[PDB]
Design a protein around this ligand. Structure first.
Ligand SMILES: NC[C@@H]1O[C@H](O[C@H]2[C@@H](O)[C@H](O[C@@H]3[C@@H](O)[C@H](N)C[C@H](N)[C@H]3O[C@H]3O[C@H](CO)[C@@H](O)[C@H](O)[C@H]3N)O[C@@H]2CO)[C@H](N)[C@@H](O)[C@@H]1O
Ligand SMILES: NC[C@@H]1O[C@H](O[C@H]2[C@@H](O)[C@H](O[C@@H]3[C@@H](O)[C@H](N)C[C@H](N)[C@H]3O[C@H]3O[C@H](CO)[C@@H](O)[C@H](O)[C@H]3N)O[C@@H]2CO)[C@H](N)[C@@H](O)[C@@H]1O
Ligand SMILES: [K+]
Ligand SMILES: [K+]
Ligand SMILES: [K+]
Ligand SMILES: [K+]
Ligand SMILES: [K+]
Ligand SMILES: [K+]
Ligand SMILES: [K+]
Ligand SMILES: [K+]
Ligand SMILES: [K+]
Ligand SMILES: [K+]
Ligand SMILES: [K+]
Ligand SMILES: [K+]
Ligand SMILES: [K+]
Ligand SMILES: [Mg+2]
Ligand SMILES: [Mg+2]
Ligand SMILES: [Mg+2]
Ligand SMILES: [Mg+2]
Ligand SMILES: [Mg+2]
Ligand SMILES: [Mg+2]
Ligand SMILES: [Mg+2]
Ligand SMILES: [Mg+2]
Ligand SMILES: [Mg+2]
Ligand SMILES: [Mg+2]
Ligand SMILES: [Mg+2]
Ligand SMILES: [Mg+2]
Ligand SMILES: [Mg+2]
Ligand SMILES: [Mg+2]
Ligand SMILES: [Mg+2]
Ligand SMILES: [Mg+2]
Ligand SMILES: [Mg+2]
Ligand SMILES: [Mg+2]
Ligand SMILES: [Mg+2]
Ligand SMILES: [Mg+2]
Ligand SMILES: [Mg+2]
Ligand SMILES: [Mg+2]
Ligand SMILES: [Mg+2]
Ligand SMILES: [Mg+2]
Ligand SMILES: [Mg+2]
Ligand SMILES: [Mg+2]
Ligand SMILES: [Mg+2]
Ligand SMILES: [Mg+2]
Ligand SMILES: [Mg+2]
Ligand SMILES: [Mg+2]
Ligand SMILES: [Mg+2]
Ligand SMILES: [Mg+2]
Ligand SMILES: [Mg+2]
Ligand SMILES: [Mg+2]
Ligand SMILES: [Mg+2]
Ligand SMILES: [Mg+2]
Ligand SMILES: [Mg+2]
Ligand SMILES: [Mg+2]
Ligand SMILES: [Mg+2]
Ligand SMILES: [Mg+2]
Ligand SMILES: [Mg+2]
Ligand SMILES: [Mg+2]
Ligand SMILES: [Mg+2]
Ligand SMILES: [Mg+2]
Ligand SMILES: [Mg+2]
Ligand SMILES: [Mg+2]
Ligand SMILES: [Mg+2]
Ligand SMILES: [Mg+2]
Ligand SMILES: [Mg+2]
Ligand SMILES: [Mg+2]
Ligand SMILES: [Mg+2]
Ligand SMILES: [Mg+2]
Ligand SMILES: [Mg+2]
Ligand SMILES: [Mg+2]
Ligand SMILES: [Mg+2]
Ligand SMILES: [Mg+2]
Ligand SMILES: [Mg+2]
Ligand SMILES: [Mg+2]
Ligand SMILES: [Mg+2]
Ligand SMILES: [Mg+2]
Ligand SMILES: [Mg+2]
Ligand SMILES: [Mg+2]
Ligand SMILES: [Mg+2]
Ligand SMILES: [Mg+2]
Ligand SMILES: [Mg+2]
Ligand SMILES: [Mg+2]
Ligand SMILES: [Mg+2]
Ligand SMILES: [Mg+2]
Ligand SMILES: [Mg+2]
Ligand SMILES: [Mg+2]
Ligand SMILES: [Mg+2]
Ligand SMILES: [Mg+2]
Ligand SMILES: [Mg+2]
Ligand SMILES: [Mg+2]
Ligand SMILES: [Mg+2]
Ligand SMILES: [Mg+2]
Ligand SMILES: [Mg+2]
Ligand SMILES: [Mg+2]
Ligand SMILES: [Mg+2]
Ligand SMILES: [Mg+2]
Ligand SMILES: [Zn+2]
Lengths: 150, 138, 235, 208
RNA sequence: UAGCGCCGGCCAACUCCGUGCCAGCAGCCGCGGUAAUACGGAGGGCGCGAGCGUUACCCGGAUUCACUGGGCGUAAAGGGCGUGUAGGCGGCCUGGGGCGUCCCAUGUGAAAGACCACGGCUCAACCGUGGGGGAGCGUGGGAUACGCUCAGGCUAGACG
RNA sequence: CCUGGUCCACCCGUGACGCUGAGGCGCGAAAGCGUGGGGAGCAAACCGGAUUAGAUACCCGGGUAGUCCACGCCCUAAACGAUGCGCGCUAGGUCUCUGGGUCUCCUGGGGGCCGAAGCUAACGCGUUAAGCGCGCCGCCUGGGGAGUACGGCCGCAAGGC
């Protein structure tokens, strides 16, 4: 039902008297490839617990993606922090052209063909967030004319 | 004074909408009026009307928003997400008819000033004329 | 289901300062350095509000009555005891909604210890336990008193001062739980889904509004209970 | 080039059963049957989760080694198909399936693709009646791929075509067994091919 | 005839022995001071294959000279401050001209090359035929919303 | 005494006469230079006393240039809000300086604080923007070498650009 892939696992460190203390962050994307995605960052003393927890969070926070023939309805730039994502729609057969992070996110949203670019900070976390935000901002002609009825 | 009256109007509208103002006045000009017409027709504003603030003419732009939302931040969706000035004083943007852009693959508009008058991208492309590219709205 | 000119004390708001500009639409004018609530708009919102309330009530939904204001304490404690509704009286514990599972564990320990003081086992084990667990029950009954009635997340919450209770408000928003409130001039109208624009200070306004509300509830589920006995709490 | 080495070892590295050997890859000797783990000293040890790049690389290598084509020819074909109209993946596969060696194999004149390549290079194959010794020769729809009249008495072709009696040939191919000739009817759809390959991963591999 | 490079991460491919901050490696981060997947050899593996590597140079990634597409409180970056020249820029209404801008027609834009199709060498490379393009500039005609200019008017900027 | 800037009320007058501003020109703390004067207190240099392992310092007693005036140079700075100028727009609350008004209050100009939206890498900014916009000038492009070398211009020199 729900396919999930982790983006980056990382190990961080705080400092306590007489040592470093390690924690583990995990970025997990979940999606059905039907147009529903989700993204979460779990943090735990050990890697598996962090991954599992990240999955839990990612299933908590979801995004409904309005797919048109496997691609996006229209282009978006999105700035999250210093990170910037540029998503642009593409003709079928193109395939997903993106970095690791937005590739995973898009692919799990069920995107077949798309064109992207990462600008500014490449920091995977903020890029992921940027991507989710982009997807969260997409509209359909339907939604548009839903807004402009008046 | 105002260096760019039109850019100023667009900005007035932006600033007004982000706080969800009911309406906003902008100093009146026939050009501004012509733009506002397109805005109303395309459905970005409830409408505009000429008023008088003090002894001077103004245009009340009645703004338009989405329905109240759920979760945190109930603040409704903007009907105007993005309104941005293209041709400015000091750099002016003119496009041919083949050079006329397509905003958000059709989900937006672009306002051109042509010899056949102030038009949208669809309108001018259909009329077959290019012009000065005033702004993009989506 | 009457109100109208029978509202006495409500139109009085907070002072000139301390207010929220977002509340400007619900103000009539400023008298003697006091924002006075608009007479008509109050009933205007009252209709839609109480309509929502009646719907929710006859559907079988639960409402969480909330306030700490100490003006509203002794009122809420009974008014919510009427009908079936759960209440928060003493203070709002962060996570009662979002952390609700974990908070419910405390209720389980509450009826756990009530069960302990039921059986013969009170005397079993040294007085060290008997002095402790008694205080545990003490505080558990002090805080979670009205909260014990919640077997699952509420279908709406009722709030007396939405600025004071703004945490409850906040995570009610967060959980998509409909937010009913009695708003004064110091409060943000946008956060409140169904607003009751009146004085949250005087015991009179609180009494009037909450009594009428519970009256509407029991009216919706039938049985027509007698007029609320909070009227003696005018003091 | 075109390899010339141990083949069923690749059956093992790609983790999927490939038929580069014709028969015996069907017989339970394939060693992909009895040693499904990768070749070498470390083959039986637990594999670490492969990089995205690893997956793409290995998928493209799978696709390439199936047809036994050099990376150069392969790359050229892919870029050619990329410049072309239509979906790049399907057109790629179509172009691969248009190779004379592959067609000879598909029609069952040869049990394996490599054997087919030998059959082409040695002039046992004709196209529209004219001899063609290039395995890379692109077949077009309407072309009749036959066996050399002088080669029809060869023992191997006897064996191969006697086996082909009763066997069905792919929808885009027709086969006349008695005359030892066959027709290439059209270019195969993605739907036609049974390939254990995600082409989009290969597109993604050159996408890098 | 089968060779060449690589197997610490970036980056596909790991074990034994020798060496002991030595000998050496290294594009960047780095490896080596007794049990080195990083030196040297061996087995094994990965990648290309009549080639494979290295050096140099060009564009790329580099939105790192940012027109598209960047910045300047503390990261590099506001001139010590004013006065003002040239220049850049310009509030509302009407009219004329049509310089900018826009549109139609036409000339030009050689061939080769680039793109598409068909065809000749058994294929391809190579080549032939045909088709489709095209910014720019010249000429003729037209439009006047915006910018320009000339003529008139207003008082919301500015000055008194 | 001479003289600059500025704010408010009146809605009187002119009718876009505006903004910015490469060069140019003027101003420009302290120190420093030239000429003349002045010189109480302080005080680089310097002369001693202490301290210290030493003490070319910190502490103590003296002391010259200088600090002060006039005139003429020098053009630097953590010359700082480390934030170019001008105009329009976008919640409020509070303290304060200074006008005007029907003087609880309203309205205008300036200086502070907390804060809506928003912005920011964060810190923080937030009608005195670091927000939303337009115009124009100046400037940036990894660290050291180096604000050096060379050339030019300026300066009596120190030295500056
Ligand atoms: N210079 C030869 C010319 O070729 C023309 O034809 C041109 C194109 O049709 C042809 O394209 C070929 C072809 O197989 C098919 N149409 C598609 C294929 N991807 C290309 O194959 C090749 O093209 C060129 C070299 O030819 C290179 O990029 C590369 O070797 C390869 N992509 O390549 C030719 C350019 O060399 C015309 N016949 C004529 O102008 C003339 O003979
Ligand atoms: N920090 C630069 C400042 O720029 C100011 O003006 C600058 C901005 O006001 C103006 O807007 C620019 C826009 O032109 C350009 N195309 C893109 C740029 N991101 C914008 O910047 C603006 O918008 C963004 C949000 O989008 C804000 O985060 C930012 O604070 C704001 N300056 O562009 C100008 C050139 O940078 C002052 N003139 C200057 O004194 C000051 O140093
Ligand atoms: K932003
Ligand atoms: K998110
Ligand atoms: K040695
Ligand atoms: K070691
Ligand atoms: K080695
Ligand atoms: K480069
Ligand atoms: K200077
Ligand atoms: K001297
Ligand atoms: K400076
Ligand atoms: K007064
Ligand atoms: K913040
Ligand atoms: K601080
Ligand atoms: K501070
Ligand atoms: Mg949607
Ligand atoms: Mg940024
Ligand atoms: Mg499309
Ligand atoms: Mg960067
Ligand atoms: Mg542009
Ligand atoms: Mg042109
Ligand atoms: Mg397109
Ligand atoms: Mg379409
Ligand atoms: Mg293509
Ligand atoms: Mg293609
Ligand atoms: Mg490419
Ligand atoms: Mg690796
Ligand atoms: Mg080496
Ligand atoms: Mg040893
Ligand atoms: Mg060893
Ligand atoms: Mg080794
Ligand atoms: Mg190495
Ligand atoms: Mg070897
Ligand atoms: Mg070759
Ligand atoms: Mg380079
Ligand atoms: Mg590329
Ligand atoms: Mg570039
Ligand atoms: Mg680029
Ligand atoms: Mg560079
Ligand atoms: Mg730029
Ligand atoms: Mg930059
Ligand atoms: Mg610093
Ligand atoms: Mg300054
Ligand atoms: Mg400087
Ligand atoms: Mg103008
Ligand atoms: Mg001019
Ligand atoms: Mg003209
Ligand atoms: Mg030509
Ligand atoms: Mg041919
Ligand atoms: Mg043409
Ligand atoms: Mg002409
Ligand atoms: Mg005309
Ligand atoms: Mg005109
Ligand atoms: Mg005039
Ligand atoms: Mg005046
Ligand atoms: Mg007047
Ligand atoms: Mg007059
Ligand atoms: Mg000036
Ligand atoms: Mg100057
Ligand atoms: Mg000076
Ligand atoms: Mg001095
Ligand atoms: Mg002197
Ligand atoms: Mg002297
Ligand atoms: Mg002294
Ligand atoms: Mg001494
Ligand atoms: Mg000492
Ligand atoms: Mg001594
Ligand atoms: Mg002394
Ligand atoms: Mg002297
Ligand atoms: Mg000077
Ligand atoms: Mg300062
Ligand atoms: Mg200041
Ligand atoms: Mg300040
Ligand atoms: Mg100041
Ligand atoms: Mg200032
Ligand atoms: Mg700095
Ligand atoms: Mg400022
Ligand atoms: Mg300046
Ligand atoms: Mg000025
Ligand atoms: Mg000013
Ligand atoms: Mg003020
Ligand atoms: Mg001051
Ligand atoms: Mg603050
Ligand atoms: Mg905020
Ligand atoms: Mg903060
Ligand atoms: Mg400003
Ligand atoms: Mg500088
Ligand atoms: Mg400089
Ligand atoms: Mg350097
Ligand atoms: Mg320097
Ligand atoms: Mg210096
Ligand atoms: Mg010099
Ligand atoms: Mg000199
Ligand atoms: Mg000296
Ligand atoms: Mg010196
Ligand atoms: Zn096999």
């Amino acid at each position: 039902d729900f396919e999930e892939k982790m983006i980056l696992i990382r190990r961080t460190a705080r400092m306590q008297a007489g040592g470093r203390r390690f924690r583990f962050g995990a970025l997990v994307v979940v999606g059905d490839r039907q147009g529903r995605v989700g993204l979460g960052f779990g943090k735990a003393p050990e890697v598996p617990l962090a991954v599992q927890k990240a999955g839990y969070y990612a299933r908590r926070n979801m995004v409904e993606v309005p797919l048109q023939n496997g691609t996006i309805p229209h282009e978006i730039e999105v700035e999250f922090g210093a990170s910037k994502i540029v998503l642009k729609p593409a003709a079928p057969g193109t395939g997903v052209i993106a970095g690791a992070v937005p590739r995973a996110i898009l692919e799990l949203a069920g995107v077949t063909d798309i064109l992207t670019k990462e600008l500014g900070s490449r920091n995977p976390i903020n890029i992921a967030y940027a991507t989710m935000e982009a997807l969260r901002q997409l509209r359909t002609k339907a939604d548009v004319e839903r807004l402009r009825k008046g | 004074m105002l260096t760019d009256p039109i850019a100023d109007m667009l900005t007035r509208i932006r600033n007004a909408t982000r706080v969800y103002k009911e309406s906003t006045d902008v100093p009146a000009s026939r050009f501004k009026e012509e733009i506002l017409r397109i805005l109303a027709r395309e459905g970005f504003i409830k409408g505009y009307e000429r008023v008088d603030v003090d002894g001077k003419p103004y245009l009340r732009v009645y703004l338009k928003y989405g329905p109240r939302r759920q979760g945190p931040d109930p603040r409704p969706e903007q009907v105007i997400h993005h309104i941005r000035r293209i041709s400015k004083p000091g750099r002016r943007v003119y496009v041919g008819v083949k050079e006329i852009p397509r905003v958000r693959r059709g989900l937006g508009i672009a306002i051109l000033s042509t010899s056949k008058g102030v038009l949208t991208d669809r309108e001018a492309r259909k009329l077959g004329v290019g012009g000065e590219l005033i702004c993009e709205v989506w | 289901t009457v109100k109208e000119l029978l509202e006495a004390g409500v139109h009085f708001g907070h002072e000139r300062k301390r207010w929220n500009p977002k509340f400007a639409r619900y103000i009539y004018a400023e008298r003697n350095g006091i924002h006075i609530i608009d007479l008509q708009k109050t009933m205007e919102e009252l209709e839609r509000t109480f309509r929502f309330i009646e719907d929710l009530a006859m559907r079988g939904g639960t409402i969480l009555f909330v306030g700490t204001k100490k003006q509203a304490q002794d009122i809420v404690r009974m008014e919510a005891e009427r009908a079936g509704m759960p209440y928060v009286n003493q203070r709002w514990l962060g996570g009662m909604l979002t952390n609700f599972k974990t908070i419910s564990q405390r209720v389980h320990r509450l009826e756990e210890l009530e069960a302990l003081f039921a059986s013969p086992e009170i005397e079993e084990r040294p007085k060290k336990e008997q002095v402790r667990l008694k205080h545990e029950l003490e505080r558990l009954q002090k805080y979670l008193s009205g909260f014990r009635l919640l077997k699952r997340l509420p279908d709406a919450i009722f709030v007396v001062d939405p600025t004071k209770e703004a945490i409850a408000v906040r995570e009610a928003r967060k959980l998509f739980i409909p937010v009913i409130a009695l708003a004064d001039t110091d409060s943000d109208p946008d956060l409140v889904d169904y607003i009751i624009p009146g004085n949250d200070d005087a015991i009179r306004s609180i009494q009037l509004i909450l009594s009428r509300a519970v009256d509407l509830i029991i009216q919706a589920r039938g049985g027509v209970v007698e007029p609320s006995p909070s009227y003696a709490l005018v003091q | 080039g075109r390899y010339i080495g141990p083949v069923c070892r690749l059956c093992r590295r790609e983790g999927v059963k490939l038929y580069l050997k014709g028969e015996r890859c069907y017989s339970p000797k394939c060693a992909m049957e009895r040693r499904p783990y990768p070749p070498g000293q470390h083959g039986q040890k637990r594999a670490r989760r492969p990089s995205d790049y690893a997956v793409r690389l290995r998928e493209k290598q799978k696709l390439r080694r199936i047809y036994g084509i050099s990376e150069r020819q392969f790359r050229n074909l892919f870029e050619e198909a990329s410049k072309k109209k239509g979906v790049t993946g399907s057109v790629f596969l179509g172009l691969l399936e248009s190779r004379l060696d592959n067609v000879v194999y598909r029609l069952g004149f040869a049990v394996s693709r490599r054997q087919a390549r030998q059959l082409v290079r040695h002039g046992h194959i004709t196209v529209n009646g004219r001899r063609v010794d290039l395995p890379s020769y692109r077949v077009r729809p309407g072309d009749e791929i036959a066996v050399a009249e002088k080669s029809r008495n060869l023992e191997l072709i006897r064996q191969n075509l006697e086996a082909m009696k009763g066997r069905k040939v792919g929808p885009w191919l027709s086969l006349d067994v008695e005359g030892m000739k066959g027709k290439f009817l059209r270019l195969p759809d993605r739907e036609d091919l049974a390939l254990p390959v995600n082409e989009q991963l290969v597109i993604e591999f050159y996408s890098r």
